[PDB]
């Protein structure tokens, strides 16, 4: 138990090191409790006004690439801090990151979301949900269920301590395709899961079944990533020559 608390604290410490924009920082921005106000993008005119941050919907989605590549870098830093991670076979670390990063990006995306919109570029902007919903199909339908997931995930009131371990658990998923040595992965995960269980019991003592809800949220995130991947397949079927950051080419390769 005590060692499980020591591991929880170590993970929160690294998450703090690795991720500049914490959930706590983000919620402070979203509730005006902070530091300069985000610029609001609610229509085409405010969008072109805020550009210092192809057809519009492709422009908006392709501009997420800069952030996603930074996030991968952050997530890699955080993964390396998880005890046991760097001692795993190197190709298995790559595998874990390859199939993990988007789950973690959507996890952190929820932290930047409320029912009305999403923070962008380190909180310097706020894109509204209605604006995103007005985009041409299939783009306009895509984010809606992301907001839905975020609103329910945020209702659980996890903090950064909680999230750090939740994230560690996800990265140490033994079932990613083509992992060469699964057992040491699972042994790490099993211990993380115990740290998470205790973390949730001490930190959310009135919250019935939180541990199990969180397991289900990991399944929801796989589903969300499956959908994210199919949005890009659908769009590649007509946007033949669409630039893609080389880091992300590695991640999307084979999917």
């Amino acid at each position: 138990s005590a060692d499980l608390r020591a591991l929880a604290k170590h993970l929160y410490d690294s998450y703090i090191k690795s991720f500049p924009l914490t959930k706590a920082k983000a919620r402070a921005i979203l509730t005006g409790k902070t530091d300069k106000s985000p610029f609001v993008i609610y229509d085409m005119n405010s969008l072109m006004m805020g550009e210092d941050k192809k057809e519009v919907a492709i422009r908006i989605f392709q501009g997420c690439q800069f952030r996603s590549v930074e996030a991968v870098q952050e997530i890699t830093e955080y993964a390396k801090s998880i005890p046991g991670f760097v001692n795993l076979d190197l190709n298995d670390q790559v595998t874990l990151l390859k199939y993990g990063v988007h789950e973690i990006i959507y996890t952190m995306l929820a932290s930047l979301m409320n029912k009305d919109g999403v923070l962008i570029s380190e909180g310097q902007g706020f894109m509204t949900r209605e604006f995103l919903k007005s985009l041409r199909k299939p783009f306009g339908d895509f984010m809606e269920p992301k907001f839905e997931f975020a609103v329910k995930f945020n209702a659980l009131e996890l903090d950064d301590s909680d999230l750090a371990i939740f994230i560690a658990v996800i990265i140490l998923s033994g079932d990613r395709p083509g992992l060469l040595n699964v057992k040491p992965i699972e042994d790490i995960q099993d211990n993380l899961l115990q740290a998470l269980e205790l973390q949730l019991k001490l930190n959310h003592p009135e919250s019935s079944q939180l541990f199990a809800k969180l397991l289900q949220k990991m399944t929801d995130l796989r589903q969300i990533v499956t959908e994210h991947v199919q949005l890009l397949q659908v769009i590649k079927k007509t946007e033949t020559d669409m630039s893609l950051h080389p880091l992300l080419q590695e991640i999307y390769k084979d999917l």
């Binding site: 991968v72 870098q73 890699t76 390396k80 760097v86 190197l90 190709n91 670390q93 790559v94 990151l97 390859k98 080389p246 880091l247 590695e250 991640i251």
Partner: peptide
């Protein structure tokens, strides 16, 4: 080669 693998070794 692999960009992830470089970020892992850094």
């Amino acid at each position: 080669p692999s960009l992830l693998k470089k970020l892992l070794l850094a």
